[PDB]
């Protein structure tokens, strides 16, 4: 599938698991589903931190239905980015 | 419309009533379902929300001892239960879905409390101006000030709605500055933490409506008092 070009919203509060990860429930606003969810994690400085995504190949099936995304944030301040473009959903996180 | 509500109710004072809200196309389990009260010609009042995945309920303190919210994921339905009905309960009740603004609304259910004795009644959002007389083509500005910080995860959970006569509200802006899909570019939002602004530039004839801001970072997900936007009548 092609990468999602649209915007994402949070369907519910970000939930902390009992294994140092977070569950992000995202809602897709674009019209190009089925599509692959653009996902990235950054440090306080804004440098991309690799291999933090737990959910393998997150995909939007139906835009009306939200998608669960599990990610492992690093210790301290970080940023969880869902979607493509400069206007993408950027979540400030502290672990 | 993906949210279908039960029919109008005519109920006796002191009695109880249950309203239903059935979803289609998506699982209510995967969302936050809210109930919103609107007394005749008055503002939107957030009653509470349920997370049907775990059954968690949160209410505005004003509704404690008046409203109860339940959900049934099996039948994809959310319910509102009102106790000891009084004239103050006569209103249109809407169900809605969403956290970063309510993009989905039911058509509303009118509850009319009949005449007679019986029943009992049981964060600050400052929206200005209460009334706005506009010149078409001008820049129209509506402000909302919260008594507490509305930011979460470095984003401002401030949303804006438009409501036209005899219609449910429509989401315009979410997360303070993000334009909802299908909304014209003349609508823009700005602000952070406690101070926010909705700008309509240039204002057009079809923008005549009542506008509401709302915060949702933490409960209660309080609406502003509203701004009735009308074309000036000289």
Token duo for residue B109: 């259910």
For A76, the token pair is 């301290």
Q: Are residues B86 and B148 in the same domain?
A: no
Give the residue numbers spanning the domain of B101.
Answer: 1-119
Would you state the structure tokens that stand for residue B77, as one six-digit string? Answer: 């339905």
Q: Do A55 and A70 form a contact (C-beta atoms < 8 A)?
A: yes
The answer on B97 and B79 residing in a single domain is: yes
Q: Are residues B135 and B89 in the same domain?
A: no
Q: List B229's β-bridge partners, or say none.
A: B132, B209
CB-based contacts of B32, cutoff 8 Å, min separation 6: A11, A12, B49, B50, B51, B97, B98, B99
Structure token digits, residue A26:
């995202």
| Domain stops at, among B94, B119, B144 | B119
Residue of B nearest to A10 (CA): B100
CB contact under 8 A, B100 and A93: no
Q: Under an 8 A CB cutoff, do B32 and A11 touch?
A: yes
Q: Where are the domains of chain A?
A: 1-95
Per-residue DSSP letter, A18: T
B62 and B173 in a single domain? The answer is: no
- The answer to whether position B231 is within a domain reads no
User: Does a structural domain hold residue B229?
Assistant: no
* B100 shares its domain with B129: no
Total domains, chain B: 2
- Please name the residue of chain B whose CA is at the shortest distance from the CA of residue A78: B153
Q: How far is Cα B173 from Cα B175, in angstroms, rounded to an integer?
A: 7
Query: What gap in Å lies between CA A83 and CA A38, rounded to an integer?
Result: 5
**Which helix (H) or strand (E) element contains residue B190?**
strand B187-192
CA distance A1 to chain B (A): 22
Searching chain B, which residue's CA lies closest to the CA of residue A31? Answer: B181
The architecture of the domain spanning A1-95 is Sandwich (2.60)
Contact list in A for residue B181 (CB cut-off 8 A) is 7, 29
Q: B167 and B104 in one domain?
A: no
Beta bridge partners of A54: none
Boundary of a domain, candidates B98, B119, B140: B119
Cα B45–chain centre separation: 6
In A, minimum Cα distance to B178 occurs at A87
- The verdict on a CB contact (< 8 Å) between A91 and B175 is no
Say yes or no for a CB contact (<8 Å) between B99 and A9: yes
Distance from CA of A64 to the nearest CA of B (A): 6
Residue B230 lies in a domain: no
Please name the residues in contact with A47: beta carbons below 8 A apart, sequence gap of 6 or more. none
The answer as to whether B202 is a domain residue is yes
Q: Do A90 and B155 touch (CB under 8 A)?
A: yes
Do B31 and A66 lie within an 8 Å CB cutoff? yes
Instruction: Determine, yes or no, domain membership for B13.
Output: yes
CATH number at residue B211: 2.60.40.10
B234 located within any domain = no
Give the Cα separation of B207 and B132 in Å (integer).
Answer: 12
In a domain, B25, yes or no: yes
- Here the tokens at position B139 are 């820049």
**Separation of alpha carbons B160 and B87, rounded Å:** 29
This entry's atomic model was obtained through X-ray
Last residue within a domain, chosen from B95, B119, B143: B119
Instruction: Answer yes or no: is B232 within a domain.
Output: no
CB contact under 8 A, A93 and B26: no
Instruction: Indicate if B1 and B14 belong to the same structural domain.
Output: yes
């Amino acid at each position: 599938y092609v990468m999602c070009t649209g915007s994402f919203k949070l369907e519910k509060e970000v939930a902390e698991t009992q294994h140092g990860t977070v569950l992000v429930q995202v809602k897709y606003e674009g019209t190009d589903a089925p599509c692959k969810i653009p996902f990235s994690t950054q440090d306080e400085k804004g440098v991309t931190q690799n291999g933090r995504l737990i959910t393998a190949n997150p995909i939007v099936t139906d835009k009306e239905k939200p998608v669960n995304i599990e990610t492992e944030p690093p210790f301290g301040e970080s940023y969880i980015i869902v979607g493509a473009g400069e206007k993408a959903l950027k979540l400030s996180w502290f672990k | 419309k993906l949210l279908e509500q039960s029919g109008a109710e005519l109920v006796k004072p002191g009695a109880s009533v249950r309203l239903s809200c059935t979803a289609s196309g998506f699982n209510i389990k995967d969302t936050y379902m809210s109930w919103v009260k609107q007394r005749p010609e008055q503002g939107l009042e957030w009653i509470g929300r349920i997370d049907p995945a775990n059954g968690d309920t949160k209410y505005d303190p004003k509704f404690q001892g008046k409203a109860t919210i339940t959900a049934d994921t099996s039948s994809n339905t959310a319910y509102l239960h009102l106790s000891s009905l009084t004239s103050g309960d006569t209103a249109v009740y809407y169900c809605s879905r969403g956290w970063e603004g309510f993009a989905y609304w039911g058509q509303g259910t009118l509850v009319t409390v009949s005449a007679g004795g019986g029943g009992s009644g049981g964060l600050v959002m400052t929206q200005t101006p209460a009334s706005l007389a506009v010149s078409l083509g001008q820049r129209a500005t509506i402000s909302c000030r919260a008594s507490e910080n509305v930011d979460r995860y470095g984003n401002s959970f401030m949303h804006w709605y438009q409501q036209k006569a005899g219609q449910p509200p429509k989401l315009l802006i979410y997360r303070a500055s993000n334009l909802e899909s299908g909304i014209p570019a003349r609508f823009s939002g700005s602000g952070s933490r406690t101070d926010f602004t909705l700008t309509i530039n240039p204002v057009e004839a079809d923008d005549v409506a009542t506008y509401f801001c709302q915060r949702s970072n933490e409960v209660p997900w309080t609406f502003g008092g509203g701004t009735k936007l009308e074309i000036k009548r000289p």
